[PDB]
Design a protein around this ligand. Structure first.
Ligand SMILES: [Zn+2]
Lengths: 140, 113, 439
RNA sequence: GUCGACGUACUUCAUAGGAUCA
RNA sequence: UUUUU
């Protein structure tokens, strides 16, 4: 009901955006702030969301990625619970978007981007060049 | 005593031994031909595979390895070397294409679940 | 016409051929009439064929079948020079040579053709030299009852009825007796023989018919099991009851050991999948039937075309129904010439590489390469005379087909200038050793 | 002069790799 | 096909 052909008529500001594990790496690599970078790209308030699978995925990374773990635990970033055994974040992220059509997916993996692309009405955010880019979001 | 003489001989053999590996190790060090090093590497991977010297990776070990690969994406064509070869028509050649594909299949392995 | 078993010594292939009987044999058949009254013999061949094509006498028994048992017995007589033995018709030199070679591989004879202590020890049994060696090594971990049953079954012949000689019922009985192992014909035999032990005497006949089992052979297998257990108990220290033959299931550890004891007697009949040696010539696909997967026996005489040496799985083996790829190496009892001019091998059981090297170490069928070098593989040197290293064992005897086994960590000691392998080492044992010298 | 060298502008040849299925 | 301590 939220989808008009390929146009999602439910996703409206402020946006709820799921943070993928690799998104944080390139956000750090490009010196782009998570909260403001999304604000600049979309010109709207963004509510970043980190699920348990990505959060567990981050902790397994090791001491090298301590900064990303610290940023992931910033109080502004809300947490999303998981009711599934598997810890694979890509499978978790694909699952949630299918259930409810309100989430932006912020990621940089080519494989996960293709799977989300096949799902209709899912805006897909990525970090490239110097700042964030949003692909399938007409209100921009 | 004469046992001291036995000690010197045992040391002498050990010293003569260490030199032999040093001479052989020095000579193999200088040879850095791709074909020669490629043949040695292939034979080594067979021996380790055949003798199973390497321990089996636990599911948790594979997950950690997969996590780092997703975190970094180090084995795609966006790397400096891969991008340099691709953009300048050096990958049309067979040999440098094999190295690129070797890199890509290795990345795919770590992506497997 | 008579169906004779012809044994081709060159390739070890057994063939059954229908050919003309000898004149004496025909005369003997004609003699069956005339025992109770004047009689007639109607021959279905012309006198022209008889006078020309029929041999006067059939070839003596000695010149047609293996002589390894006889050589061992005569060597136990201290008849060292079998060639000068006054035979009625001396056996062929080639047959004698392979008999000596087979005995040497089994450890019966030393390199100078004298009887070893094992050779004397095998001659005390009523079995072929191969089957003795199986019983010889069975002492470990109470495996003796299983080896006796296996040995008796093979010594007497197969109590199984084949599909050609005869469907759901047949496979149902087969399913029950293959449960011990999915890669062994031998353990299928052991399953039946030991299963019979729990059958009460009254139901034994119903069991044999229900399972397509030849009645006569199993009864002799029972009888021959008692005689073996009698000779061993009597000569090891004797009344044996039917209770003595009752035995429980082998443990997983035992089953692996039985494969090793079985391989002890058939060290010379190990076959390797051809794709392992010559992947170009033997291209195996997932569509290829298991029955059509080529194998190469050890010590096979090399031909210009390697396909001439190929050996395929027999239709009767359980492996044809295995459903996955067959094991890397296989033990076979004998080779039969199929109707398609394809050699078929009667499998015994699968053997892994490292155990196979262990057993062949005591035989003349294993040689060691030079120490390996590289990451992980490093020749640890305790002293000028002893070291720890990885070597590649070569299996098989350069005119034959030998192949290299997986590398195995060994302990070597320098003896009279030559490095001699003392003992094998596990991967953990070598790794701890590499650590110890570092500390 | 179907001339040599250089400069300039273009054309062209070297791309498939793994898994499954028949 | 036979057959053996
Ligand atoms: Zn989840």
């Amino acid at each position: 009901s939220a989808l008009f052909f390929q146009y999602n008529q439910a996703i409206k500001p402020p946006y709820q955006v799921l943070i993928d594990t690799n998104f944080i790496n390139f956000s750090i690599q490009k010196k782009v702030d998570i909260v403001r970078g999304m604000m600049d790209c979309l010109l709207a308030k963004c509510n970043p969301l980190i699920t348990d699978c990505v959060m567990a995925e981050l902790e397994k990374l090791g001491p090298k990625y301590r900064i990303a773990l610290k940023l992931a635990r910033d109080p502004r970033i809300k947490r999303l619970s998981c009711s599934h055994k598997g810890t694979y974040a890509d499978d978790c992220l694909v699952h949630r978007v299918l259930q409810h059509k309100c989430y932006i997916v912020a990621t940089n993996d080519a494989g996960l981007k293709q799977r989300i692309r096949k799902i209709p009405g899912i805006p897909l955010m990525s970090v490239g060049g110097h700042a964030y880019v949003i692909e399938k979001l007409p209100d921009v | 005593p004469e046992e001291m003489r036995k000690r010197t001989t045992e040391m002498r053999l050990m010293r003569e031994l260490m030199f032999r590996e040093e001479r052989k190790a020095r000579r193999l060090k200088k040879i850095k031909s791709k074909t020669y090093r490629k043949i040695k590497k292939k034979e080594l991977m067979k021996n380790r595979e055949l003798a199973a010297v390497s321990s089996d990776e636990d599911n948790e070990d594979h997950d950690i390895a997969r996590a780092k690969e997703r975190m970094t994406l180090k084995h795609k064509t966006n790397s400096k070397w891969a991008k340099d070869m691709i953009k300048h028509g050096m990958t049309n050649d067979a040999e440098t294409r094999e190295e690129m594909e070797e890199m890509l299949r290795q990345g795919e392995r770590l992506k497997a679940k | 016409r008579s169906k004779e078993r012809k044994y081709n010594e060159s390739n070890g292939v057994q063939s059954f051929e229908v050919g003309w009987v000898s004149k004496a044999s025909a005369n003997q058949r004609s003699g069956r009439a005339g025992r109770t009254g004047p009689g007639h013999c109607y021959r279905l061949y012309s006198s022209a064929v008889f006078e020309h094509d029929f041999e006067q006498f059939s070839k003596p028994e000695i010149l047609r079948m293996p002589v390894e048992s006889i050589v061992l017995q005569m060597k136990s007589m201290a008849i060292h020079n079998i060639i000068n033995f006054p035979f009625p018709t001396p056996p062929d030199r080639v047959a004698l040579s392979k008999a000596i070679q087979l005995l040497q591989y089994l450890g019966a004879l030393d390199n100078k053709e004298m009887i070893t202590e094992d050779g004397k020890k095998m001659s005390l049994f009523p079995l072929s030299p191969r089957f003795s060696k199986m019983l010889l090594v069975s002492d470990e971990k109470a495996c003796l009852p299983y080896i006796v049953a296996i040995v008796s079954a093979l010594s007497v012949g197969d109590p199984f009825i084949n599909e050609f000689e005869l469907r759901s019922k047949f496979y149902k009985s087969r399913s029950q007796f293959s449960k011990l192992d999915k890669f062994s014909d031998v353990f299928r035999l052991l399953s039946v023989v030991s299963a019979m032990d729990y059958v009460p005497k009254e139901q034994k006949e119903i069991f044999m018919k229900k399972n397509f089992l030849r009645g006569k052979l199993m009864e002799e297998i029972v009888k021959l099991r008692k005689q073996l257990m009698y000779i061993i108990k009597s000569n090891t220290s004797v009344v044996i009851r039917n209770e003595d033959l009752k035995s429980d299931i082998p443990s997983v550890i035992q089953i692996k050991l039985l494969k090793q004891m079985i391989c002890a007697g058939f060290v010379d009949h190990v076959a390797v999948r051809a794709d392992v040696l010559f992947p170009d010539d033997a291209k195996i696909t997932n569509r290829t039937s298991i029955i059509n997967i080529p194998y190469i026996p050890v010590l096979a005489t090399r031909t210009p075309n390697i396909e001439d040496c190929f050996v395929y799985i027999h239709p009767t083996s359980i492996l044809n129904n295995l459903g996955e790829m067959p094991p890397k190496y296989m033990l076979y009892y004998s080779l039969h010439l199929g109707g398609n001019n394809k050699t078929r091998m009667n499998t015994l059981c699968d053997i892994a590489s490292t155990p196979l090297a262990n057993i062949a170490r005591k035989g003349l069928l294993l040689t060691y390469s030079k120490p390996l070098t590289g990451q992980g593989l490093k020749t640890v040197n305790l002293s000028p005379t002893e070291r720890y290293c990885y070597v590649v064992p070569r299996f098989g005897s350069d005119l034959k087909i030998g192949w290299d086994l997986n590398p195995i960590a060994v302990h070597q000691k320098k003896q009279k200038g030559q490095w001699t392998v003392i003992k094998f080492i596990t991967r953990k044992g070598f790794q701890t050793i590499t650590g110890e010298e570092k500390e």
